[PDB]
Symmetry: D3
Subunit: 241 residues, 6 copies
């Protein structure tokens, strides 16, 4: 219902947009209209955006499709993610825009493929794609990280998320945000960003520490200690305001 | 004209570079020497760097040239921006380096096309190109933003300029800088950066606030409050100094 | 010999990895298994990654090899860098991983080619490649910067290293880090980062200043003053801790 | 099914071939081994070889696969055609070989798509692909031609088959063969080649004439008159021998 | 103007074709509808079809367009060439078809560019393009040949025209036809095909000899002797009938 | 060495031609002038002309060079072949022209690689390339055919050499020529064409037959019987003359 609604909004938009812009009309038909569900479209776009002669789009599309088949909820996150960005970003009005044009959104959804592959012990492929993702969209997310749905990577450029990190539902992350890693450890070194959290541009959250639900982290904050539920944190190093 | 003065410096440099670097001689000839004016070299270059099978270089060129044909001051800005970069960056000695090699310069000039397109109601196309610029140059500038001339985007990775921003003439912006947006609004949300301002690397300027003419923002500052003319602001959050 | 050791380690892993991932098997063979030494594999990958019609991989590879043949220590640095990454980054377990997949490692080894061309007064070429590195890896390093070996550029996106900079051996630099630049100085404006230094994410180090051996710079710090050996700097601006 | 026997044979060769040639191992896996039937492999290959930026492989595959869903005996024909080539060409040993490497086989199978499109009244797409087929394979078949199964287009270079041609089952056609077009007439202008005919290299067969079942046409022969069942025609112009 | 009427017919078809086929709609708009005249459309296509990284579409277009500038009769020939193919080929109905899809037409128009280039003493570039034409369309026409207009190369595969050939207006040539060259001469070795001639598939016209106006050459014919006006020639070697 | 003489000539032509055509300057430098011997230039050229994502030019180049290194006579044949074409084609005047622009020349040299691959039991790779040659150059020659040196494939469209053929030294072959195969039989089916033979355009020679030294086959001839030394054969079927 969420997934079908979003898909139908996107199709409805794609018809209007193709009428208005004949330079992109075939793009709208081949990327959205001639497909039958969101997963058909997402796999097409991601495959194109991540293609390389080592593994071209046509062949990569099949890996993505097998992932969607064997874990259908990956596509459902994408639908939440589309709605989340549209809602929270005043610049985004169309349902189709995140799907078509936002590289943070593409990064997130592409990470869901590497996470799947990592859990099937196709680690070498996950790593190959981690890099593609990083090069295509400027976003470095380790395949082993655990990310919920309703996530917004707003202007994703510069985001880094480490192997042990956890991002729960409804979290929002701006450009230049780093999650995790103190100069020290191994075996569980990265933040746990609980649900509803807002993280401002440039913010560095480092270490196995909790950022509690509905916390705001200030722009360019360096967060080294746990942040309580509903708190605001700001400064370098960060203080609870 | 500055355009014609920069153009003639660029041609004179190309001839000598072509002689000294035969690997790149055809590049200098097809990019610069066989074009009558700056517009031709700029339309050729941007079209190449922003090309995609959805809209190849040869086709994009025609859009860029239609923009130059109907708003020629767009090219006059490019020349201002070239001079700005060469003048303000000690590492850039040649007039041609910005045109050929500086991705920050390239993003700005590409934004100018998207701005044009946005004002012609070709908004799908403008969004499509916004994404391309973000992928090609690591710079996110919304087409509706208002940017003047003589602007330098130096090593421009991670720069973000929001829908509602204003950047006046002779402004300098380094890597990691974002303009705008408290998570507080729709309608006019982003900064107005006035003439001659220098914004240091990694600074975040958030809100519908004034950064007054000739101010200096220190590196990694978070500017949440209006900065008076000629002031230096610094720290997270920023204080006057 | 570290070079030979690392290379044997990487060939060992490649045969095993080819066995597990048939989708990637030929990639491991043409990249690693059918080359006699590290420099054959390196020149292959970097050429592919920096390829452009202006200078396709097949040409570029020759240039990289001329540099390797006439300056073998470039390759020995690569092996140090590989070991540096593996040992220092917890997420990195295989010796092949840095070689194949990490854009930070690729950008450093690429800079070494641009440094060589700069020193042979082939500066057009060095500048053309600087821009390609910046596009492919989102790492901006001036060809004239002097960088040692045992270097890690961990998740390298947004790293900017200035023309005058020096980075001594065994330095670690994370995403978002800038080296150097203030105002109208020329001729030696950029930091000297000394052996063993560790620069946290988002740090901006500005000016012709010293960062003393084995110092730690905290994340998002702005370093305007020289940093003592074995010291920790944090804050905006940075204070000794 | 001939189709399933042929497919089994192709899968069985592909495993052997992948072990023998690690330069090509990934190619055998992405082309054959990771697909579930002959249609998957055929649509993948054809899409790749007819790809253009106007219609990339990944889109083209969708269109080809739709044809296969609507008319599965298009695949059964390919299987028949593979068997034909392997059997009649002594140089062809492997079942995989026609599927992978024979531009005549590819031309025919591609024609089957355009024929389908032509009857679905998508004549623009059909003409577009007729050109792409002509350029990729050097075979010019009009989409309206009627071609049965068991067909071999051996070496196929300069084969031309007119709009009104009929080629029945089990016909063999060598390089440089032209079907049809006398003088000027309109409406039904091209040969009807009957079951089991062998047409030698260079033969030109003009006008709405019957070439009867099991006839042989000699090399470089011009056939202007009907050829009776089991007859051998030869010379310019052709006489029964 | 024939040229103007042809162009207007083409646009008119493009409008209706784009409405019928969404997959090709953008192609129609960017190839035809968004261009002012036949010359702009033709330069777009040829550039694209002969593109190579040595000279990309975008660069080559400027050269094609320079030729069109300093000798606009080249574009008029193209317009007759289009009318000829449509009028003489029963299979070709639309004015747009030859422009978009017929490689015989594309080869002819492409040779006109090389002819221009040859006569401007740009012989190295004319030669480069002669090879590109031959690779792209399988038609080998030497730059120094003299071809008039109203020419139809129907299904052009295998056509070979030598350095001294002369083809006058309204000539028709099918697949596999060769013009000229015998037992070693130099200086004027090649046929002079006068106007209104029709040359059947596979015919080979060797030596410096007149093929008289309005003659018909038979398929697979070898014409070693001069052919009188209005005459039919057939056989190998050829004889008047 | 013939090799060296040819090489010096070519190098000197490229210097002049580079100076005279700046659009191609870097092409002359990257293809010819920066390589030390003919092998270097050849492997570069052929790698580019046979490249494909399945095996890109950079990897193809290594295979080609391995062959040249382990069997240096292959390069010597190339030089003979350059000389043969230059001498025998009156249109071909420069020594660089064959190396750079003639598909017949390229097909022959590409065949030498497949033949080498075949004789190293790399049957799959040789077959992969057979097809690439056939697509790149419109020439089908089987890797197991035995071809000598001083060969000319003059305008090569449509040439077909069977698996069992033998072409001894100094044979010339025009467009549309076919060697061999009659019908049922295996093991030694194709013609043995001896030293010096000239085969005219369109000639089909079929069966395990001797074409004796310095024979002349006429255009469009079908040769079913043996041809005596110095004899001339012409017609369909061919009679000695």
């Amino acid at each position: 219902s969420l997934t079908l609604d979003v898909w139908q909004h996107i199709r409805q938009e794609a018809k209007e947009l193709a009428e208005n812009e004949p330079m992109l009309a075939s793009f709208f038909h081949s990327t959205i209209l001639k497909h039958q569900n969101l997963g058909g479209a997402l796999s097409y776009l991601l495959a194109n955006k991540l293609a390389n002669p080592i593994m071209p789009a046509i062949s990569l599309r099949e890996i993505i499709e097998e992932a969607y088949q064997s874990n259908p909820s990956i596509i459902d996150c994408a639908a939440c993610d589309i709605q989340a960005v549209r809602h929270r970003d005043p610049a985004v009005e169309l349902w189709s825009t995140p799907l078509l044009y936002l590289k943070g959104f593409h990064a997130i959804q592409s990470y869901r493929i590497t996470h799947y592959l990592w859990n099937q012990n196709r680690k070498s492929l996950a790593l190959y794609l981690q890099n593609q993702i990083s090069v295509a969209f400027d976003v470095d997310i380790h395949p082993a990280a655990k990310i919920g749905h309703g996530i917004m990577f707003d202007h994703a450029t510069g985001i880094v998320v480490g192997e042990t990190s956890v991002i729960e539902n409804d979290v929002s992350i701006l450009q230049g945000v780093t999650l995790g890693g103190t100069g020290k450890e191994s075996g569980d070194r990265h933040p746990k960003v609980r649900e509803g959290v807002m993280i401002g541009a440039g913010a560095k959250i480092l270490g196995n520490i909790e950022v509690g639900k509905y916390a705001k982290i200030g722009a360019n904050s360096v967060v080294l200690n746990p942040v309580p539920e509903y708190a605001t944190a700001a400064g370098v190093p960060a203080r609870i305001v």
